[PDB]
Amino acid sequence: VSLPRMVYPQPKVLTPCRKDVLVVTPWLAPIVWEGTFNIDILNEQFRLQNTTIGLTVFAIKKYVAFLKLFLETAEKHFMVGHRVHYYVFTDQPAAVPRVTLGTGRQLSVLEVRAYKRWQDVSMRRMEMISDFCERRFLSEVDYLVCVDVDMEFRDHVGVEILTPLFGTLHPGFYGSSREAFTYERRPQSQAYIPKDEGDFYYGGAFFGGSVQEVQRLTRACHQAMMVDQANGIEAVWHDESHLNKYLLRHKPTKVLSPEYLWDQQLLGWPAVLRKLRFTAVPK
Amino acid sequence: VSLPRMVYPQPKVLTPCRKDVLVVTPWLAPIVWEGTFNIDILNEQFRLQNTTIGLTVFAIKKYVAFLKLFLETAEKHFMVGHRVHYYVFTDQPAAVPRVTLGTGRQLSVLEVRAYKRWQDVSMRRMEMISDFCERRFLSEVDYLVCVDVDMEFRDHVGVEILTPLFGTLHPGFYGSSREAFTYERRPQSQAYIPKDEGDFYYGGAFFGGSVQEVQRLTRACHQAMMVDQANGIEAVWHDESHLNKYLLRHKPTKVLSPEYLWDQQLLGWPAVLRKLRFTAVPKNHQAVRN
Ligand SMILES: O=Cc1ccc(-c2cn([C@@H]3O[C@H](COP(=O)(O)OP(=O)(O)O)[C@@H](O)[C@H]3O)c(=O)[nH]c2=O)s1
Ligand SMILES: O=Cc1ccc(-c2cn([C@@H]3O[C@H](COP(=O)(O)OP(=O)(O)O)[C@@H](O)[C@H]3O)c(=O)[nH]c2=O)s1
Ligand SMILES: CCCCCCCCO[C@@H]1O[C@H](CO)[C@H](O)[C@H](O)[C@H]1O[C@@H]1O[C@@H](C)[C@@H](O)[C@@H](O)[C@@H]1O
Ligand SMILES: CCCCCCCCO[C@@H]1O[C@H](CO)[C@H](O)[C@H](O)[C@H]1O[C@@H]1O[C@@H](C)[C@@H](O)[C@@H](O)[C@@H]1O
Ligand SMILES: [Mn+2]
Ligand SMILES: [Mn+2]
Hints:
It is classed as transferase/transferase inhibitor. Two copies of one chain form a homodimer. Chain A is an alpha/beta fold. Helix content of chain A is 26%, strand content 17%. Chain A has a single domain (1-283), classed as Spore Coat Polysaccharide Biosynthesis Protein SpsA, Chain A (Alpha-Beta Complex), CATH 3.90.550. In chain A, the strands form two sheets. Chain A has an eight-stranded mixed β-sheet, covered by helices on one side. In chain A, strands 6-10 form a two-stranded antiparallel sheet. In chain A, helix 2 (67-77) links the parallel strand 2 (52-59) and strand 3. One copy of the ligand CCCCCCCCO[C@@H]1O[C@H](CO)[C@H](O)[C@H](O)[C@H]1O[C@@H]1O[C@@H](C)[C@@H](O)[C@@H](O)[C@@H]1O binds at residues 170-173, 176, 182, 237, 240, 263, 266, 280 of chain A.
């Protein structure tokens, strides 16, 4: 796309703003931290493409209680100025709160089965997103962002995250060496990653990409989980373990910093985080 | 694409290698410097896609003299391990020197007209690349890389540069403020950029991208030059001025550091350059008077 004239501060080749963190992966994907992007430029780029972003969130059984704060804060902070389609997957369509939406934003309630086992609720998100990629998303949105519901937006989360495939650094482990990552370590599981492999430990609560890439990721993870199930094994961190195996072998084209997936009660507000954008609500 | 198990040092989130330079633009395009990339990973990614790279170079009039060292050093340093097509445009096909190529690398020579004015030889590269894309001469590769011929490969230039659209930081201006950039400053020119705009000054001697993006860029720059011609205007730095206007409005998805476009005889070898990959060769004797 062709941008109009814009007035903004010139980038300085010899004076980077972030010197305290890694801002690009070894496969040349940016790692998104505050200070690395000019949102005015990116906003104009994505508006000129008429971008629609889908946001998927599961609110099943007791978790429907989190929806009100999740959606109201999403209206203040998520992709503001862009076309947004919320996909709320729930077993209680009647319990979805009436949240007032900004212009250009819409919400669809998708009714789904609640699995008894909390691990199955978390893990079967992969199957449901994969199925809906086909049923709906492919014809409705350009990008999908797939997140946990037990969360609130506190600061900007915008088109800087958009790319064919992204994962997010887990807030617990961004400073950890690969040997300490809680990857699945049993070779009997499809999620197995040995101790001398791994780039990052990605959080299962925030990933996304193009519809095509997300369809592929979620289908792959679901299949891997089904194979494990038939072999009587379940990965240590469920869907997140499979997400990690997938992103090790299919490198993300952007990686989000833990600004995008945080828990302030458990981890505070470290100096390397200039903004806390999307944060846990006590569960 | 799905990679196999690989063993390499873990990237450290709290410990960047390059702290002395900007390694990502404000629109989140990487700026490619030594230390930012693991070429083992990138080679695997690109080979899994069976990537073919086309390298276009113009050697018109006395510039055929540059071909021998250009092609020999490309054999040593450019995209080694990947399929490469050299597309050499010349007015003297019989003057293209014999150069032995590695497996999977192919030379195609095409005869083209020699414009009288050197400015025109340089500028008309955009029209020629655009036309030969459209005619399916240049379109059957995955990426096109478009360079000057008066150059030598000195170190690795590989798939770390590939992306839908890339420009390269010109060696004379990487540390300069935007008001110092030698953009076309006449409002009457299509290449006009005023003093309060501009991200970088990109060099006309090294740009590229996917076939689709290179087709679009070269067609756009050619049409802009034709509009200027009809208005009786020739931009200050010719095709480079239009390239700069194009990349200001269509941001590149990677930007190459000056490691990739240098002149050591003129500028030395400053500390910020850990490698010099593609460098100018003296060209005073190859000049022709308009
Ligand atoms: O009592 C234990 C539970 C663990 C997960 C449960 C669950 C999760 N979910 C969805 O799965 C996501 C992941 O579960 P979680 O937030 O509890 O997991 P983590 O924050 O540890 O990753 C939630 O954000 C919801 O979107 C539900 O909708 N209903 C639920 O009952 S219930
Ligand atoms: O006598 C003055 C000349 C200036 C350019 C000339 C020219 C350039 N070219 C091509 O245009 C490119 C740009 O010209 P250049 O390398 O001389 O200019 P710079 O952009 O490095 O200043 C060259 O690398 C060649 O590919 C030719 O093939 N033949 C030429 O006679 S001749
Ligand atoms: C060396 C650091 C040692 C300390 C690490 C502290 C955070 C641990 O985090 C858990 O990590 C697990 C994987 O190993 C799962 O991702 C789990 O869902 C996550 O807890 C979730 O995310 C957390 C951030 C909290 O919000 C917790 O309530 C959630 O259940
Ligand atoms: C004193 C600080 C500003 C000047 C700093 C030193 C380089 C100047 O560079 C010229 O810059 C022009 C645009 O302003 C054109 O790109 C020209 O082609 C280029 O010269 C080309 O590239 C050069 C590097 C040399 O190889 C020269 O011989 C070439 O003709
Ligand atoms: Mn959660
Ligand atoms: Mn040159």
